[PDB]
Amino acid sequence: VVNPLFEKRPKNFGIGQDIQPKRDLTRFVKWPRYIRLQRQRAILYKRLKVPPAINQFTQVLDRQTATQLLKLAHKYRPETKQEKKQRLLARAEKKAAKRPPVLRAGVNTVTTLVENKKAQLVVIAHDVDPIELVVFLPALCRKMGVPYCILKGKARLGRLVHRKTCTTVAFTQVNSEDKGALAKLVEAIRTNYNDRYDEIRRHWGGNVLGPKSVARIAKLEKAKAKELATKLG
Amino acid sequence: GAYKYIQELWRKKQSDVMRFLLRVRCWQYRQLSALHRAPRPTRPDKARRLGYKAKQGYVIYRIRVRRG
Amino acid sequence: GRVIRGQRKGAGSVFRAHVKHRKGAARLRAVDFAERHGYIKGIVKDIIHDPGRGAPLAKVVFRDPYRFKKRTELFIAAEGIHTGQFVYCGKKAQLNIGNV
Amino acid sequence: VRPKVLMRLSKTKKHVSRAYGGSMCAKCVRDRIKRAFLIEEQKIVVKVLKAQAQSQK
Amino acid sequence: KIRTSPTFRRPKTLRLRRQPKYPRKSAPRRNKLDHYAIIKFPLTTESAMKKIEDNNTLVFIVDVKANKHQIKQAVKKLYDIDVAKVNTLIRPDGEKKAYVRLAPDYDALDVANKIGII
RNA sequence: ACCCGGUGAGGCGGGGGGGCGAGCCGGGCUCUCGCUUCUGGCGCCAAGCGCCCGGCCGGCCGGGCGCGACCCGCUCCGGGG
RNA sequence: GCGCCGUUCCGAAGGGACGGGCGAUGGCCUCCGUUGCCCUCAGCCGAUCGAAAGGGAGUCGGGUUCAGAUCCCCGAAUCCG
Ligand SMILES: [Mg+2]
Ligand SMILES: [Mg+2]
Ligand SMILES: [Mg+2]
């Protein structure tokens, strides 16, 4: 049935026996300078002693709470440029013949209404490129007694609004329909952050070496542990 | 607002957070070229004091000077 | 008074080396998988005399294990190597003259 | 002849009708054939000796 | 996608052609090297007349910016005659002397009497 | 952080898989190895296996993916610091 | 600071070509070129200048002028596309 001329011809990929195939070589790419910069920058963020004012952005509110917070923030999204023209056209037709509460974006408006004590929940993006914009705001919400949460990605927070990026979002006023779920989110965010902000202040960052050096130190420590075990017996 | 907090946060440079930020920024800018474009300011508050606004045609160049 | 001869030698443009008739730089093979773990074989094509050098050099033809192309190297020919000789190179190579 | 002249010459004028035609002399060609046969036969002998070593061991 | 080569060259991005909204200049420049401007005058030298009478040619004086194909098409257009070949030289006066060898079907003496030179 | 060397930055570190040695009662455990040395030969653009679907009439013609060619990683490997 | 160093050195340094798929055109829309996109392939070495004695394909004879002749005329070829 089968053709006996079909010879199996394996290549012996030994050292100097045959040519080597074009395997995966993503680790050994001579990357460009900007990629090589942005990788070892995050490596230095893993290595160096991160202060707690920057380490507070490393703890992110989890996925099951973040989805409910996005579901709550989708109801109170601000106006569109076309919706503004539609409301102006409706106002013009009303002139020819109470505003709903919306979001308050931007660190300026957010901090002014937090010192005015109007916020009930303050959403923070963890990944701002100048970090000094938002360092003071968690401790400021701690002092004012305002619940603050920190989420991954400023793009997903800036696509709630009709923009690109957004650092801080305030929940000033909500309707009677969206009160109980807002209180259940405020309670979880408060017990996550405001009850345990002192441990966030005590928690330092970094001091984590690379995997090769950790493996070498662990190899020497396990060797010395096996030695000090086998002398006692 | 937030700009006064950002202002004295850039003032208090001898603290641990700010020494860490100056060290990481000086490292990153030393790996960067001698003359390039920063599309957004590193000090937005100091830029707004000097007269920078957020509109089209206002560009910021990050350059280095050899010290001494 | 004038600029002395040892100072004039450091500037250049007269006292530079005569590197026209020289064949190339007598450099060994770079470190890789074959130099690190096992070994790789290469023939001695011909031994040539390099100008400005007492040592004769050797055109050693290696086979590249990654791409199909025969490489050449300018080895420093030690005393005892003849042409048509298989110079091995690597960690698992044997200890004899004409082997690194 | 000079090398750019070789566009004018025909195909048979530039090489010889043989394996390694116009590149290698026939003595080194037949020596290379002898070597390419005998190293392969030596590899066959080494494979038979390895099979016998695995048969005993 | 696996990385075959260890080098990372620049990826072949897309670029577009020139589709301008308005041209740079308003009008295209007219041909200032016309056929009438590229031929100044034929010579009335005794040696030039001997060359015409013997070797079936015509001797012209040409602007220095010309080509042999330009002189050939200019003689073919402004004399209604076929050209065998054109031999050019630049005189020490400055202009280009052109020996236009004609085809033997027409006569150089006849076309010289036709254009007036003698 | 900073400095030097090599590369066309080509297999770096751990965890797997297999064989060769020692001791204990088929089993785990400490270590080494990973295919090339009698010869001036040749060696690339996959063989083999499995899963698919496209067209034509169990058969015909043209393609893709994974094994072969282990997995996870955070600095290209080293040398100073 | 006019600019200087540096020629492979702290570079994302290619616009190239084989084959396949898709649409748009052109010509007895047969069959093929032309461009547009995608898949796929690729090492090079430094942009550029630098010898009228270096390397460098291919022309010789006779005749002609007051001055030009491997150039003009005649007869023979020859190189490249
Ligand atoms: Mg001087
Ligand atoms: Mg030149
Ligand atoms: Mg020359």
Swiss-Prot record, chain A:
GO MF assignments: RNA binding
Cell compartment(s), UniProt: Cytoplasm
GO CC terms, sorted: cytoplasm; ribonucleoprotein complex; ribosome
Cross-link (Glycyl lysine isopeptide (Lys-Gly) (interchain with G-Cter in SUMO2)) at residue(s): 22, 71, 212
Positions where N6-acetyllysine occurs in the chain: 8, 71, 184
Keyword Ubl conjugation: yes
Primary location group: cytoplasm
Domain of life: Eukaryota
Keyword tags: Acetylation, Cytoplasm, Isopeptide bond, Ribonucleoprotein, Ribosomal protein, Ubl conjugation
Function of the protein: Component of the large ribosomal subunit. The ribosome is a large ribonucleoprotein complex responsible for the synthesis of proteins in the cell.
Subunit architecture: Component of the large ribosomal subunit. Interacts with CRY1. Interacts with DICER1, AGO2, TARBP2, MOV10 and EIF6; they form a large RNA-induced silencing complex (RISC).
Sequence similarity: Belongs to the eukaryotic ribosomal protein eL8 family.
The name this protein goes by in its record: Large ribosomal subunit protein eL8
Shown chain mapped onto the complete sequence: 80 to 319 of 319
From Swiss-Prot, chain B:
Lipid attachment, kind N-myristoyl glycine: 1
Residue(s) carrying Phosphoserine: 33
Record's subcellular location: Cytoplasm
Source domain of life: Eukaryota
Function: Component of the large ribosomal subunit. The ribosome is a large ribonucleoprotein complex responsible for the synthesis of proteins in the cell.
Family note: Belongs to the eukaryotic ribosomal protein eL15 family.
Self-association state and partner proteins as the record states: Component of the large ribosomal subunit. Interacts with IFIT1 (via TPR repeats 1-4).
Protein name (record): Large ribosomal subunit protein eL15
Species annotation: Oryctolagus cuniculus
Complete-protein stretch covered: 2 to 69 of 204
Curated annotation (Swiss-Prot), chain D:
Gene Ontology biological process terms in this record: translation
Main localisation: cytoplasm
Molecular function terms, GO-annotated: structural constituent of ribosome
UniProt entry keywords in alphabetical sequence: Acetylation, Cytoplasm, Endoplasmic reticulum, Isopeptide bond, Phosphoprotein, Ribonucleoprotein, Ribosomal protein, Ubl conjugation
Subcellular location: Cytoplasm, Cytosol; Cytoplasm; Endoplasmic reticulum
Span of the signal peptide: none
Covalent link location (Glycyl lysine isopeptide (Lys-Gly) (interchain with G-Cter in SUMO2)): 50
One GO term describing the cellular component: cytosol
Protein family per UniProt: Belongs to the eukaryotic ribosomal protein eL34 family.
Subunit structure: Component of the large ribosomal subunit.
Function: Component of the large ribosomal subunit. The ribosome is a large ribonucleoprotein complex responsible for the synthesis of proteins in the cell.
Record-given protein name: Large ribosomal subunit protein eL34
Protein source organism: Oryctolagus cuniculus
Residues of the full protein shown: 59 to 115 of 117
From Swiss-Prot, chain E:
Domain of life assignment: Eukaryota
Keywords carried by this UniProt record: Acetylation, Citrullination, Cytoplasm, Isopeptide bond, Methylation, Nucleus, Phosphoprotein, Ribonucleoprotein, Ribosomal protein, RNA-binding, rRNA-binding, Ubl conjugation
Phosphothreonine modification, residue list: 7
GO BP annotations listed: translation
Residues where Phosphoserine is found: 5
Main location: cytoplasm
Compartments in which it is found: Cytoplasm; Nucleus
Molecular functions (GO terms): rRNA binding; structural constituent of ribosome
Compositional bias segments (type: Basic residues): 1-29
PTM remark: N-terminus is methylated by METTL11A/NTM1.
Presence of keyword Acetylation: yes
Gene Ontology cellular component list: cytosolic ribosome; nucleus; ribosomal subunit
Modification N6-acetyllysine, positions: 32
Keyword Acetylation: yes
Ranges for region Beta-like import receptor binding (BIB) domain: 1-36
Subunit structure and binding partners: Component of the large ribosomal subunit. Interacts with LYAR and GNL2. Interacts with MDM2; this interaction may promote MDM2-mediated p53/TP53 polyubiquitination. Directly interacts (via BIB domain) with IPO5, IPO7, KPNB1 and TNPO1; these interactions are involved in RPL23A nuclear import for the assembly of ribosomal subunits. Interacts with IPO8.
Family designation: Belongs to the universal ribosomal protein uL23 family.
Domain free text: The N-terminal beta-like import receptor binding (BIB) domain mediates interaction with IPO5, IPO7, KPNB1 and TNPO1.
Purpose of the protein: Component of the large ribosomal subunit. The ribosome is a large ribonucleoprotein complex responsible for the synthesis of proteins in the cell. Binds a specific region on the 26S rRNA. May promote p53/TP53 degradation possibly through the stimulation of MDM2-mediated TP53 polyubiquitination.
The protein's name: Large ribosomal subunit protein uL23
Full-sequence portion shown in this chain: 39 to 156 of 156
